[PDB]
């Protein structure tokens, strides 16, 4: 069986008590995950060592709070009290979890199933060949000696709008924001990097990335976390918003790829 569940941000104990109920069967099951491992949840570090144990039977995208795990542990960043991350920082086994953490893809596409996922879902101006190069460019610069360079260029909002001319600072930045911090679209795709509304709560002429018909959306169903006010409603047909907010006390939600069945964990907080 395939299991995709969304946001964790150090929900270990929902993590675990969600996958026993669908009994989880690493060998058997696959278990995909949105991102956002880590951060306000209180085990961040039992959950980045489970991940990881879990080889081949787990298929993750890296979310912003990973890429932001990252830049702290690199020295790029400051770190927030307010992420609960010092536990994992200051394990003895950091450097191996993060080094891990890092080579992590982007993006995950499954063909025989016609799905693709990454944290934030995939802008409308993107085809599948470009979201494939973009996430090869970015996970390039992730996995190599010079990673905490990237981190550094990743911060900022602009450019807003893509184009294959783009290049450098503002090319890496324009696919992290795409791949990890993407809701709402203008009219012509460009992105707006500020409101974090519910799709009902927002300012025109604001529309979520999915309410804009993208040539990937039209071929894949696309699975997604990230955006915690959409509370996992309101999508198209194909569009699966797993973030229904563990960590902010909502629900852990798991989706059963076979018959599109959902199981919920209610939050401990
Ligand atoms: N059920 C909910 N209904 C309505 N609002 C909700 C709900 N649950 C959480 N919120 C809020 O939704 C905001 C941004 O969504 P989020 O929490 O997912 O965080 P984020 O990933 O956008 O963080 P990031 O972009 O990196 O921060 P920044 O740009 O530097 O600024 C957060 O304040 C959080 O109170
Ligand atoms: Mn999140």
Redesign the pocket.
């Known amino acids: 069986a395939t299991y995709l569940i969304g946001d964790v941000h150090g929900c270990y104990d929902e993590l675990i008590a969600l996958l026993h109920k669908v009994e989880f069967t690493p060998g058997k099951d696959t278990l995909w995950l949105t991102g ?1 491992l880590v951060a306000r949840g209180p085990g961040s570090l039992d959950v980045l060592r489970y991940v990881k144990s879990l080889g081949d039977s787990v298929r993750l995208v890296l979310g ?2 990973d890429l ?1 795990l990252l830049a702290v542990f690199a020295g790029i960043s400051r770190n927030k009290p307010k992420d609960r991350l010092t536990p994992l920082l200051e394990a003895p086994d950091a450097d191996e979890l993060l080094n891990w953490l890092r080579r992590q893809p982007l993006l995950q596409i499954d063909e025989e199933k016609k799905l693709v996922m990454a944290h934030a879902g995939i802008t409308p101006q993107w085809d599948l060949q470009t979201a494939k190069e973009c996430a090869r460019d970015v996970e390039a610069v992730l996995s190599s000696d010079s990673y905490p360079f990237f981190l550094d260029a990743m911060y900022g909002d602009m450019p807003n709008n893509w184009s294959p001319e783009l290049r450098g600072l503002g090319r890496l930045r324009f696919i992290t924001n795409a791949f990890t ?1 993407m809701r709402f679209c203008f009219p012509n795709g460009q992105l707006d ?1 500020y409101s ?3 799709p009902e709560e927002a300012p025109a002429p604001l529309k979520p990335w999915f309410a804009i018909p993208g040539p990937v959306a039209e071929e894949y169903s696309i699975a997604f976390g ?4 959409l ?1 996992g409603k309101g999508t198209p047909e194909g569009i699966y918003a797993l ?1 229904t ?1 563990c960590c ?1 006390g ?1 629900t852990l939600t798991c989706l059963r790829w076979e018959d599109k069945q959902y199981f919920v964990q209610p939050s401990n907080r």
């Open positions: 956002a912003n709070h932001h911090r990097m974090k509304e519910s990230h955006w915690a006010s509370e973030d907010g902010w909502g």
